[PDB]
Amino acid sequence: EAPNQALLRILKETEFKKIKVLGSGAFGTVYKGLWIPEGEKVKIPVAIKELREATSPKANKEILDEAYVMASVDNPHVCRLLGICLTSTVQLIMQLMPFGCLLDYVREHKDNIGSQYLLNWCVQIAKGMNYLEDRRLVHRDLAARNVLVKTPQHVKITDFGLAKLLEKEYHAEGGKVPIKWMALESILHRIYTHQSDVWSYGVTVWELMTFGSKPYDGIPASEISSILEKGERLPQPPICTIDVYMIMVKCWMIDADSRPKFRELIIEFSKMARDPQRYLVIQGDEDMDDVVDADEYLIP
């Protein structure tokens, strides 16, 4: 209940160039692009999200919710909005995360990812997520596909489509949901907590440790609820020492208050990132003149 004084910045269509398409799908369309704030003498590499040319009234309501949330965050491990552009087709402008999402990155680079990288990513994500806990904000769709990569050393949490600002729970109408990342209480009772986000964290860590495997690859979504009730969980990844897998399993307790808190998760993975070969066992560990990254373009 502190007042949210974040500025929403509105961008003229003239200010930014679309260079190339990064992706299209359910979301709409994403472009690599370049932004020149007028009068400023900088050039900022950006990504631009347009809706799939939809003029739908529910669709504009959706991205403006996303815009809302993105505009209200400020953390090195969380993706922030740069601006919106109120063309007939509404556009979200954010920082360009050149290496795409982390899921695709671990897959593309399996044979070259060391323990130091994996554990540092885990730490960075726990930080992002802890920042969101401080801001009383529940992600609801944490997964490896929703973590973007600025550089291989630096990743940020994103996709706030489903993200909901809080007292101590959120209750939903189903829509579509990422069932395989969801806490049990969320599947059964449509309840979402920070601690429910921890479950999703667990599964995300698991996605990284298996270099992009699909959780429950075989199983149909309908089935999941029952399995977790039985007590089955995801398997221990080959690279994982018991110390690491233990932490994943703790994220997957039935009793959500018995799960760890992101602040604790930072600590554990930090200790592990200090001596990373003790905790993960992997074969082979061993014009642009005026360009400025978004993280150096502060405006107030």
Ligand SMILES: */C=C/C(=O)N1CCC[C@@H](n2nc(-c3cccc4ccccc34)c3c(N)ncnc32)C1
């Ligand atoms: C593996 C992730 C993935 O498959 N995609 C699809 C290709 C486009 C990728 N992408 N998305 C964003 C992104 C995410 C959330 C919000 C916004 C808002 C405006 C513009 C983009 C986004 C990407 C960004 N910011 N940078 C590079 N690629 C991005 C995700």
